[PDB]
Design a protein around this ligand. Structure first.
Ligand SMILES: CC(=O)SCCNC(=O)CCNC(=O)[C@H](O)C(C)(C)COP(=O)(O)OP(=O)(O)OC[C@H]1O[C@@H](n2cnc3c(N)ncnc32)[C@H](O)[C@@H]1OP(=O)(O)O
Ligand SMILES: CC(=O)SCCNC(=O)CCNC(=O)[C@H](O)C(C)(C)COP(=O)(O)OP(=O)(O)OC[C@H]1O[C@@H](n2cnc3c(N)ncnc32)[C@H](O)[C@@H]1OP(=O)(O)O
Ligand SMILES: CC(=O)SCCNC(=O)CCNC(=O)[C@H](O)C(C)(C)COP(=O)(O)OP(=O)(O)OC[C@H]1O[C@@H](n2cnc3c(N)ncnc32)[C@H](O)[C@@H]1OP(=O)(O)O
Lengths: 186, 186, 186
């Protein structure tokens, strides 16, 4: 039989109040707190914390302060990653981010979700679906990414967009819901 | 004659810089600060603070850190309430929330508003309209609730939604503006 | 030849990792940190910090806590300015705000942007376009303002709006994208 952590990672229904998960979420908030309390000139310190927090980190990385995570280890990031002010990463499942990806302020990537049915939801069962972002992607400010979304290479997501469906590579996409408005040279 | 606090609660025009209201807003920020400075394993402490902050609290409650309120006492919450990261409650008027309601990160419930006319607005007069959320409601990430909105039981509001009109029970509602897209079994 | 700071202010392409700009961004975060760590009854202190932070400040000003800026000096604000909880000012270029303007919580004003082309973007080059807000303007909660936007006098921007095009004076504007829905008496 699977553990609650295993059900979680596999996109199945799990109980978040599982002791192991609660204490993993505690460990995450400790590093998060340490990260957000650092001083503006403590780049070395922040970088170390990110390497303990995230599942995988490239050579260079810059995440502006007040970062929000659930577990940290489900966050996998490529080279030269940039995340601006107040980004939220609900990494119940894998948030896999490619190379040269930069996040504007207030970008929210949610992998978690709840049952539509109230009785199921009120029971405490919960789900996750991994999010994928390709190489060379600029994500605008206040963009929301929903569970199970894949974003291709060479994509520019306009500010305030709500990504509900997959966005193909080599496109510009804006809106609520988020749709392609332009193609671009590869 | 009514006091400014009374005008506020009754949905009438009031001056926010009223001495009583300013010092009530100060008291609110003190508890808010205490709440947001707690350590990740201080559940007992956070729970106590919420019972001093909110108008009414159920048996169990979990609000993730960095909460934003104006007064606190206008916030009335039911059983098993959950509020994720960085929720904002502008409780100029009553924010009444039912049982088994869970808020995703960055949910913003605003009850306050200003006069459309500039001269009225520049005079400092201000208004409020209470917000109502029924039992068994899942509110998505980055959802904004406008003043005077009532949300029925069994409602799922999709992420990034902007609730401008009332949402009937037993529905799924998304978008900007927020509209019903599905009905659901009761 | 122009410096990187000069290219920035002039709307041209610049490298943000320029030593002068990095240390100006450090100075900004120091004041920001001091501002956000103040206690709820330290109005005098916050006001002083804002006068060191912002390019220009009127007689009276109230900015609620957790403010986010990049440089500060590009932010020019008029009389009786109000900014509520968690506003973000990406002032790569000039953010010029008129008199009697009030910002609701979570208002995000972005002047910065990146090249559409990935190779240009991955090179580290970056741009800015100034944002202008007229006198007597109420900006709703969670409103996003994109680079190069001018907002006229007597304008009410509804909550959750995403301003992508210029908004004429004497109008009410909502939506994603943000459009005029009403005219109003001057
Ligand atoms: C340092 C850092 O981390 S970056 C900091 C900045 N943060 C940000 O969020 C900035 C993001 N920049 C944007 O969102 C811009 O709007 C861009 C890049 C998407 C603009 O791309 P463009 O395709 O050139 O927009 P353009 O002005 O040419 O017109 C696009 C059309 O779609 C609309 N549109 C553009 N952006 C958006 C948007 N974000 N949301 C909704 N609609 C939009 C326009 O209104 C226009 O409509 P229309 O022509 O049918 O009338
Ligand atoms: C631990 C916690 O606190 S929870 C943390 C997570 N935070 C979140 O915000 C997650 C919320 N989940 C969502 O918003 C999901 O999108 C859900 C639950 C609304 C999806 O519901 P569904 O009805 O099953 O969406 P579905 O994929 O079937 O299709 C719905 C249609 O409306 C659209 N749609 C779905 N969600 C949204 C949305 N949030 N905004 C705009 N449009 C949407 C879809 O594009 C689709 O359009 P179409 O069929 O006309 O082409
Ligand atoms: C203390 C402080 O700092 S303020 C704190 C509060 N923060 C806020 O964000 C509150 C802002 N208030 C709002 O956004 C309000 O919705 C207002 C002021 C824009 C309402 O203005 P009104 O024109 O009177 O809205 P009204 O109810 O009359 O109807 C407007 C129409 O546009 C729609 N609409 C109204 N507001 C919005 C919105 N924010 N987004 C999208 N659509 C909207 C309505 O659905 C309605 O549609 P319809 O008539 O075609 O069916």
């Amino acid at each position: 039989a699977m553990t609650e952590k295993e059900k979680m990672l596999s996109g199945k229904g799990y109980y978040a109040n599982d002791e192991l998960l609660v204490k993993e979420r505690e460990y995450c908030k400790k590093l998060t707190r340490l990260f957000n309390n650092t001083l503006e000139d403590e780049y070395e310190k922040r970088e170390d914390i990110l390497r303990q927090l995230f599942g995988s980190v490239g050579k260079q990385i810059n995440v502006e302060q007040n970062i929000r995570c659930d577990y940290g280890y489900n966050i996998h990031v490529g080279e030269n990653f940039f995340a601006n002010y107040d980004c939220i990463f609900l990494d119940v499942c894998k948030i896999e981010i490619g190379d040269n990806v930069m996040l504007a302020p207030n970008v929210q990537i949610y992998t978690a979700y709840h049952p539509i049915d109230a009785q199921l939801r009120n029971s405490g069962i919960e789900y996750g679906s991994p999010v994928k972002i390709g190489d060379n992607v600029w994500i605008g400010g206040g963009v929301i990414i929903t569970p199970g979304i894949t974003i291709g290479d060479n994509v520019v997501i306009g500010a305030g967009s709500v990504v509900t469906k997959d966005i193909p590579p080599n496109t510009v996409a804006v809106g609520n819901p988020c749709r392609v408005i332009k193609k671009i040279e590869e």
